[PDB]
Amino acid sequence: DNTLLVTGPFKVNGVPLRRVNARYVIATSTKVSVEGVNVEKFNVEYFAKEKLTKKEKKEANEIKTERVEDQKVVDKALLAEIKKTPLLKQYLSASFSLKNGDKPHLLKF
Amino acid sequence: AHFKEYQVIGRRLPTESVPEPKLFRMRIFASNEVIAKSRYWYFLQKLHKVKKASGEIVSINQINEAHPTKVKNFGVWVRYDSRSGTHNMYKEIRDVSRVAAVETLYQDMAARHRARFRSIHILKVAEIEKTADVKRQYVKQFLTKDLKFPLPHRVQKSTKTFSYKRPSTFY
Amino acid sequence: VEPVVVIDGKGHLVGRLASVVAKQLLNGQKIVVVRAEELNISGEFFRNKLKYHDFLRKATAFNKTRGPFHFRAPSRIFYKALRGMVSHKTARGKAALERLKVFEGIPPPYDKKKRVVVPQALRVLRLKPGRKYTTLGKLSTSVGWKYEDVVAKLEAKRKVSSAEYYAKKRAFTKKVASANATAAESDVAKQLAALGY
Amino acid sequence: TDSIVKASNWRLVEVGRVVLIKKGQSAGKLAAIVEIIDQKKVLIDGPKAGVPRQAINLGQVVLTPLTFALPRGARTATVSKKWAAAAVCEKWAASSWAKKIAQRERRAALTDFERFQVMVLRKQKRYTVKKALAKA
Amino acid sequence: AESHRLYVKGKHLSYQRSKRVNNPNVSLIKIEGVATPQDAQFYLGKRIAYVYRASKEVRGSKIRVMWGKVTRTHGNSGVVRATFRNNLPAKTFGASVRIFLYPSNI
RNA sequence: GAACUGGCGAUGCGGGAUGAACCGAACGUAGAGUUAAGGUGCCGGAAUACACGCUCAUCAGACACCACAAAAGGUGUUAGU
RNA sequence: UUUGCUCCACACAAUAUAGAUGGAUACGAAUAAGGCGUCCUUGUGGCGUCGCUGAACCAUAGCAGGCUAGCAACGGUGCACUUGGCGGAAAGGCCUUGGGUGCUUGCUGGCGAAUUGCAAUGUCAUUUUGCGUGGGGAUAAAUCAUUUGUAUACGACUUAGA
Numbered sequence: 001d002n003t004l005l006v007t008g009p010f011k012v013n014g015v016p017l018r019r020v021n022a023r024y025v026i027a028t029s030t031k032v033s034v035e036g037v038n039v040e041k042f043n044v045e046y047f048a049k050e051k052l053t054k055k056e057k058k059e060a061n062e063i064k065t066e067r068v069e070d071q072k073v074v075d076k077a078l079l080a081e082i083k084k085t086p087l088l089k090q091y092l093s094a095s096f097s098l099k100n101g102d103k104p105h106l107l108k109f
Numbered sequence: 110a111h112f113k114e115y116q117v118i119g120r121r122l123p124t125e126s127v128p129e130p131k132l133f134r135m136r137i138f139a140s141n142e143v144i145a146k147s148r149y150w151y152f153l154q155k156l157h158k159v160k161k162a163s164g165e166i167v168s169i170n171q172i173n174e175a176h177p178t179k180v181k182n183f184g185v186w187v188r189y190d191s192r193s194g195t196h197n198m199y200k201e202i203r204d205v206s207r208v209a210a211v212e213t214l215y216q217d218m219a220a221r222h223r224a225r226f227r228s229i230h231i232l233k234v235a236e237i238e239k240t241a242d243v244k245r246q247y248v249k250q251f252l253t254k255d256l257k258f259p260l261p262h263r264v265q266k267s268t269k270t271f272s273y274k275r276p277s278t279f280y
Numbered sequence: 281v282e283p284v285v286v287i288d289g290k291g292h293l294v295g296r297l298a299s300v301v302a303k304q305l306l307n308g309q310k311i312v313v314v315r316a317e318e319l320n321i322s323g324e325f326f327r328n329k330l331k332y333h334d335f336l337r338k339a340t341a342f343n344k345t346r347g348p349f350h351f352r353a354p355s356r357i358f359y360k361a362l363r364g365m366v367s368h369k370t371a372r373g374k375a376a377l378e379r380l381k382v383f384e385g386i387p388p389p390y391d392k393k394k395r396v397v398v399p400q401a402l403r404v405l406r407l408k409p410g411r412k413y414t415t416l417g418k419l420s421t422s423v424g425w426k427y428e429d430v431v432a433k434l435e436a437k438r439k440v441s442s443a444e445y446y447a448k449k450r451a452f453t454k455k456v457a458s459a460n461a462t463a464a465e466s467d468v469a470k471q472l473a474a475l476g477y
Numbered sequence: 478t479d480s481i482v483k484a485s486n487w488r489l490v491e492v493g494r495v496v497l498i499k500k501g502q503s504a505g506k507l508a509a510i511v512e513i514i515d516q517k518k519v520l521i522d523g524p525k526a527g528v529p530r531q532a533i534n535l536g537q538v539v540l541t542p543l544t545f546a547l548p549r550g551a552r553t554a555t556v557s558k559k560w561a562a563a564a565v566c567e568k569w570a571a572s573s574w575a576k577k578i579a580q581r582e583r584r585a586a587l588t589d590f591e592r593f594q595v596m597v598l599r600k601q602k603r604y605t606v607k608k609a610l611a612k613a
Numbered sequence: 614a615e616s617h618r619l620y621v622k623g624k625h626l627s628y629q630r631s632k633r634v635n636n637p638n639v640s641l642i643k644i645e646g647v648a649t650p651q652d653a654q655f656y657l658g659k660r661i662a663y664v665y666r667a668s669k670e671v672r673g674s675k676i677r678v679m680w681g682k683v684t685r686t687h688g689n690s691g692v693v694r695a696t697f698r699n700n701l702p703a704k705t706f707g708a709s710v711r712i713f714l715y716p717s718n719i
Numbered sequence: 720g721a722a723c724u725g726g727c728g729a730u731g732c733g734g735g736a737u738g739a740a741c742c743g744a745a746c747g748u749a750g751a752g753u754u755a756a757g758g759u760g761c762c763g764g765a766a767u768a769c770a771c772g773c774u775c776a777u778c779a780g781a782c783a784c785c786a787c788a789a790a791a792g793g794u795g796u797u798a799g800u
Numbered sequence: 801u802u803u804g805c806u807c808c809a810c811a812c813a814a815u816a817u818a819g820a821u822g823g824a825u826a827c828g829a830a831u832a833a834g835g836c837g838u839c840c841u842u843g844u845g846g847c848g849u850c851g852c853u854g855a856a857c858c859a860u861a862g863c864a865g866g867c868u869a870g871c872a873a874c875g876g877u878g879c880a881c882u883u884g885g886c887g888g889a890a891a892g893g894c895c896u897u898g899g900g901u902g903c904u905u906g907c908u909g910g911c912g913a914a915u916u917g918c919a920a921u922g923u924c925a926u927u928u929u930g931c932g933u934g935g936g937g938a939u940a941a942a943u944c945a946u947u948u949g950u951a952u953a954c955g956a957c958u959u960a961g962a
Contacts, residue, residue: 014913105655220772257491308707446827476583
């Protein structure tokens with residue numbers, strides 16, 4: 001459904017296996033190789049919300065075990081590729097933000 | 110506008126009493142072909158008994174400058190109409206090509222005598238091949254040996270509306 | 281880009297500075313203008329004195345108290361020139377004009393802050409060398425401002441204190457530049473130089 | 478004693494003066510002034526940098542402190558030969574003006590990972606400099 | 614860190630207008646940093662949010678948002694034209710406003 | 720007071736600050752784009768654009784209709800014969 | 801006037817915002833001249849360097865930024881104190897001494913984050929007021945009415961009265 005499968009990895013910055021919209025990301029020039037990861041398991045039916053009825057109203061106020069060992073399988077294959085070039089773990093752990101004087105039409109990502 | 114020079118060659122329409130008319134040629138500074146042909150017919154109506162309905166134009170060709178990177182001195186002879194009469198002037202311009210020289214000539218006449226394009230007639234323009242035939246001091250000033258001069262008081266235009274230091278006009 | 285912009289009014293042209301500043305206020309930038317006694321007006325001092333006398337003639341005939349008020353301070357002259365360019369009779373104009381305060385000299389809220397200039401309103405960048413100009417403090421004390429000398433004395437005291445500040449600042453920055461030069465040509469310095477810093 | 482004046486020299490325009498094109502189609506290259514048209518415009522040529530031989534207004538160029546020998550009205554083969562002989566391109570490159578230009582375009586060409594890297598390196602350099610700022 | 618801004622600041626200047634007739638359907642936005650239409654062409658199609666506060670809590674918040682987008686450039690100095698779902702209330706002339714980086718082309 | 724035409728009267732809209740007649744253009748209700756006449760320092764939407772000159776006024780000048788100035792002069796300054 | 805008034809701390813409400821979202825980052829003067837460094841005979845001095853914009857400089861990694869372990873230094877920074885100054889133009893701020901305490905991403909590790917489901921400002925600021933606590937602080941005047949006549953159309957003014 002025209003979505004991008006992404007991961008943090010979850011060990012680095014706490015972002016799980018997820019899908020995002022391609023119009024809501026910035027493709028940086030930083031590139032790592034993801035060969036050696038078996039992502040053909042995931043599809044549109046892998047992420048189902050189990051839609052809620054109108055009667056169940058949350059007045060005041062969990063995770064799939066299949067999802068958590070799938071995350072643990074993929075992220076240990078990603079971090080082995082991360083350890084080759086230096087400072088990528090720190091780069092992926094740090095957040096992105098615009099400082100004073102940053103012009104996004106002049107910035108290269 | 111930005112001027113170009115054309116040769117325009119035309120003649121009268123051929124009749125049985127006289128075929129092959131004499132094929133007059135003129136050099137016109139104009140913005141384009143339409144203005145060039147209009148000025149050609151204007152000056153031929155000033156010279157000979159012909160008009161556009163009675164004649165035709167056999168050729169129009171752009172004449173670009175032979176050496177566009179040689180610095181020349183041109184002497185220009187001009188008629189212009191003032192508010193009270195008609196006068197002849199001779200002005201000389203140091204510049205790199207004929208079309209740019211007549212562009213600065215039109216600007217100079219419009220600036221110094223308020224003469225418009227409709228009032229200025231270009232009699233002729235010719236390169237002065239020898240120095241000391243230059244007769245105006247404002248162009249003879251730039252012909253001296255080892256000419257050099259400074260440019261005092263540099264003003265640099267800024268992109269920001271606020272500057273964070275007092276600017277300098279050193280050059 | 282800034283919360284408050286402090287403009288040193290020295291050497292500026294009155295109309296060009298006012299047309300910059302009025303657009304800044306209407307866009308929503310807070311402006312404070314200091315040293316209003318050192319503004320410049322192009323033209324002879326006698327021409328601008330004659331202009332102010334022509335303005336000073338104009339008053340309401342049946343009651344002078346409701347007429348045009350002829351303010352004499354240089355800051356209020358600048359305020360007049362700027363209120364001419366802001367549509368002050370509307371709520372948007374009033375909200376714009378309350379983002380502005382103009383002073384003679386540099387008061388103690390702003391003597392420790394950073395002063396900027398407007399290069400498209402500076403006299404040395406705008407006028408041809410040779411044209412004559414005026415000083416707004418001289419014109420204003422010619423037409424009736426009473427406080428030209430007390431501002432001069434306060435400005436002399438402030439400049440003495442500021443030079444005492446600047447000597448210490450220069451000594452500290454020479455120490456920092458010396459330490460940066462001696463701590464350069466290390467591996468982190470060469471990597472930063474390769475990366476552009 | 479002896480008479481003292483402040484000389485106040487600045488950057489004469491003459492033949493052989495090296496200029497930097499400020500704006501236009503070249504916009505940042507070097508040229509050499511071949512001849513002087515009038516007070517406001519000159520004929521320049523920039524044959525090593527690919528600037529064509531042209532007349533140009535003096536407000537579109539910036540004069541550099543570099544000068545070399547040319548006769549007036551020299552054609553582009555002689556201009557290129559004297560430019561290579563005087564070797565003014567690396568003499569321009571050795572200046573802090575050209576280093577500032579190169580620094581500006583390098584900082585423009587940095588990416589986000591390189592910006593993270595310069596932040597880490599600047600933190601390390603700041604640590605060692607502020608450690609040096611405790612003994613003097 | 615200490616900064617978390619993922620948008621570009623801008624100012625709501627005015628409506629689209631002639632000398633004496635304004636048009637509230639199109640607003641004029643000064644994005645900071647851009648000073649030419651060629652640099653302003655990067656920001657076309659980006660979402661704009663005007664974020665303001667109110668005293669009365671409506672659905673868990675006292676902060677209300679008005680959404681819009683950049684449509685075209687305006688003039689020679691990098692001002693852009695913006696259209697919103699409901700037009701901006703015209704007391705916000707000079708108010709700050711947020712230009713987000715989505716929908717991104719990079 | 721007449722001749723030919725176009726208008727106003729009978730007609731709003733953009734421009735000329737303002738105005739029956741001028742310039743542009745004639746009108747169902749809306750959306751998008753492009754313009755006319757007029758403009759782009761600020762009021763005020765839009766270049767404190769670019770280029771060549773001229774002018775310093777102890778009443779400068781700043782745009783058709785249009786809201787005025789002449790004869791005569793000036794080693795002021797510029798360009799010419 | 802039945803326990804009122806002010807200040808301090810947080811506790812909850814209400815009230816709005818001309819419009820935070822890394823930092824308003826301090827010589828003066830000249831511009832047909834300067835700034836900085838250095839040297840000397842200290843000057844309107846000699847020598848070197850810089851500008852050509854802030855496209856800078858500083859800051860900037862961590863759950864909107866967690867919980868822990870170690871290394872290297874004796875630095876950097878925040879908070880409440882504390883010593884000494886300076887600042888009256890609208891000072892209400894700037895500098896400094898000492899100790900405490902927390903953090904340190906200068907360097908190397910360990911654990912956590914998901915489900916806000918493909919975005920929804922996704923809520924983190926400061927402005928005023930009230931009501932509670934519990935801890936200090938202090939115990940007035942003005943007006944009407946009477947009177948005066950230096951005042952006066954009436955108000956107002958000037959006087960007096962435990």
